Design a protein around this ligand. Structure first.
Ligand SMILES: [Zn+2]
Lengths: 351, 77, 232
């Protein structure tokens, strides 16, 4: 539960406010970068290492039969667990195109070969969407569950641009909430089924959700209809019958008012919510400890690591979990002159 | 076409109007509604077919270049 | 505005009504947008420019009715995208700027082969096929490895977003030719076919004596970077 200042040796011009961090079998890989992939690394992903507080970012590559992916900005993430038939998978969709626009793509990613010399090969495959497909969006949330006992994926939330009939140039960059219908997706076949809920009468964005034992708990986040942040946790229970995707949902009396957090998985299910934004100006400083049992959620605080007076004066920030109580956050850095590494980096740990 | 200030022009105007002046230049005020004929957004028009995805409202002129960037802080700035 | 012509009533290709006489002078360069940002921040640039590109797109379809010459008159449009330095064209056509293997913004030639042969090169680069090649990159239906994937697509990795007319600026041809001749003079002052790999100090001295020669005669002073006039 403590921070430590870092410095980037170089490449301090290749992170951008939104990005993603994945640990699949050890190494952590950084996804998303300002501008299109340079030729020094066409993969667009960087393996990340921390040695003596210093930060090293190395290029990657894929298999021959793996497809190349554009550098999404703020995608949705799913940690498809190690099982039949290919451990271990990471599903990402569908993010924001650096050329500013959206993507109806789904990307299934894995690790393929290593080393032979401390190197790692990756694989990224598209998948058709049979549906009743979900439209393109960003900042939404997607996860994976096992219902008695077969696997499925649930997508919810997120915003998007005005419908194309209403596409107004004066309102080109306006973005409103996607209609609150969730979507159930299978890896094979890619049958996407839309569902609606007579309770979720409003959309929402940036809300971190969690899956455990075919029961899914969505935390509250940002909403633009009433410009509010309903703290209220939202519970749901999903079961795949033959072949009925039966669903029930319910509202919890109290959740938490958090927006755009860093989720580190510490224990088996013992998670910490690192930080984010509680208000349109106040950012939530403190941490959060959350246990999840089949009975329910179990909440507490921890001692928040005292921030340097610098970050306490920052308007915004963000970060990602390097894994196992460890995470990385960054301050948009200012000063005279532009460094130009506009980001100071803090590592944070639990226990 | 000579990069003069509005203060500049007004001063010169008063001055020269004093000297033998049958008011020669025009007072500054009259330019501010003399360009409404030269700037954008003044001449009605239309298209066939109607223009796709671009509002058929014409009389507007200069517009801030964000096109409604949802000002939400935590989001993309 | 460059040209305004007429095809009516038909049976003819067209008649130029008014061709602009001096489009080079800024006295005809009407500004249409300004952004306090950098040429490189592709995200911010496209995010602001979406409007412009989209309405340019919607323009080329319909026709335009105005009150002109006392009467309600009609207009069509075509758009010629020329005035960009190379770097911009690449970064907006989805190429690899600027001195990588693929160089010709028109011909698919590699770098080195453009030395032995220099003349016969067909123009191929075009917007629609560039989208096609980007799609081939993304999908990779042939499941090729990295560098064969670069080759079969002729290296078009970033998705272009803004249309381009395939041509070059007139000024920066002059500028590059100027700097290249300047350096070739700096080199031919000494001996490089007699001394294959000269060193850095020799380069500084050859530059210095070149500036002395260009100053004593012709009365010419050096600059940091060469504008148009120094080139001319
Ligand atoms: Zn060529």
């Amino acid at each position: 539960m403590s921070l430590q200042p870092l410095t980037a040796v170089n490449c301090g011009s290749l992170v951008q406010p939104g990005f993603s961090l994945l640990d699949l079998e050890g190494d952590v890989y950084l996804f998303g970068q300002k501008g299109w992939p340079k030729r020094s690394c066409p993969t667009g992903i960087f393996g990340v290492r921390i040695k003596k507080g210093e930060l090293k970012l190395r290029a990657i590559s894929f298999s021959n039969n793996s497809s190349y992916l554009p550098p999404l900005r703020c995608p949705a993430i799913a940690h498809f667990e190690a099982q039949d038939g290919k451990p271990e998978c990471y599903l990402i969709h569908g993010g924001r195109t650096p050329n500013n626009e959206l993507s109806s793509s789904l990307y299934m990613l894995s690790v393929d070969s290593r080393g032979c010399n401390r190197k790692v090969t990756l694989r990224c495959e598209e998948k058709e969407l049979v549906g009743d497909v979900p439209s393109a969006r960003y900042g939404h949330t997607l996860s994976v569950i096992n219902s008695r006992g077969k696997t499925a994926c649930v997508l919810f939330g997120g915003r998007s641009y005005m419908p194309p009939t209403e596409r107004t140039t004066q309102n080109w960059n306006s973005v409103v909430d996607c209609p609150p219908q969730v979507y159930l997706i299978d890896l094979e076949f890619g049958c996407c089924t839309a569902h609606t809920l007579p309770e979720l009468t409003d959309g929402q964005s940036f809300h971190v959700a969690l899956a455990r034992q075919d029961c899914v708990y969505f935390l509250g986040g940002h909403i633009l209809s009433s410009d509010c942040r309903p703290s209220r946790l939202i519970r749901l229970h999903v079961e795949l019958l033959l072949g009925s995707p039966v669903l029930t949902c319910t509202i919890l009396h109290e959740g938490l008012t958090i927006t755009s957090a860093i989720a580190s998985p510490i224990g088996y299910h013992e998670y910490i919510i690192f930080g984010g934004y509680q208000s349109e100006t106040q950012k939530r400083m403190e941490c959060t400890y959350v246990g999840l049992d089949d009975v329910g959620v179990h909440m507490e605080s921890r001692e928040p690591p005292q921030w340097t007076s610098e970050i306490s004066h920052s308007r915004t920030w963000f970060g990602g979990s390097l894994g196992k109580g460890t995470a990385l956050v960054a301050i948009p850095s200012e000063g005279n002159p532009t460094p130009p590494e506009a980001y100071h980096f803090y590592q944070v740990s639990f226990q | 076409n000579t990069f003069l200030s509005c203060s500049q022009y007004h001063k010169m105007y008063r001055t020269v109007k004093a000297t033998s002046g049958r008011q020669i230049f025009q007072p500054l005020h009259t330019l501010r509604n003399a360009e409404k004929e030269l700037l954008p957004g003044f001449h009605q028009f239309e298209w066939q077919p109607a223009l796709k995805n671009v509002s058929t409202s014409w009389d507007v002129g200069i517009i801030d270049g964000l096109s409604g960037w949802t000002v939400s802080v935590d989001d993309v700035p | 505005i460059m040209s305004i012509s007429i095809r009516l009533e038909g049976e003819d290709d067209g008649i130029t009504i008014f061709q602009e006489q001096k489009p080079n002078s800024e006295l005809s360069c009407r500004p249409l947008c300004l952004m306090f940002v950098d040429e490189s921040d592709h995200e911010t640039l496209t995010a602001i420019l979406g409007p412009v590109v989209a309405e340019r797109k919607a323009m080329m379809e319909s026709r335009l009715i105005i009150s002109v010459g006392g009467l309600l008159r009609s207009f069509r449009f075509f758009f010629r995208g020329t005035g960009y330095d190379e770097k911009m064209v690449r970064e907006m056509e989805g190429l690899e700027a600027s001195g990588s293997t693929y160089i010709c913004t028109l011909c698919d030639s590699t770098r080195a082969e453009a030395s032995q042969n220099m003349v016969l090169h067909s123009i191929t680069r075009s917007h629609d096929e560039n989208l096609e090649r980007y799609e081939i990159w993304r999908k990779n239906p042939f499941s090729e490895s990295a560098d064969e994937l670069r080759d079969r697509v002729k290296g078009v990795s970033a998705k272009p977003f803004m249309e381009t007319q395939p041509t070059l600026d007139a000024l920066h041809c002059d500028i590059g030719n100027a700097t290249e001749f300047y350096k070739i003079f700096q080199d031919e002052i000494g001996e490089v076919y007699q001394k294959p790999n000269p060193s850095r100090e020799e380069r500084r001295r050859w530059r210095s004596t070149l500036d002395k020669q260009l100053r004593k005669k012709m009365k010419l002073k050096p600059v940091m970077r060469m504008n148009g006039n120094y080139a001319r």
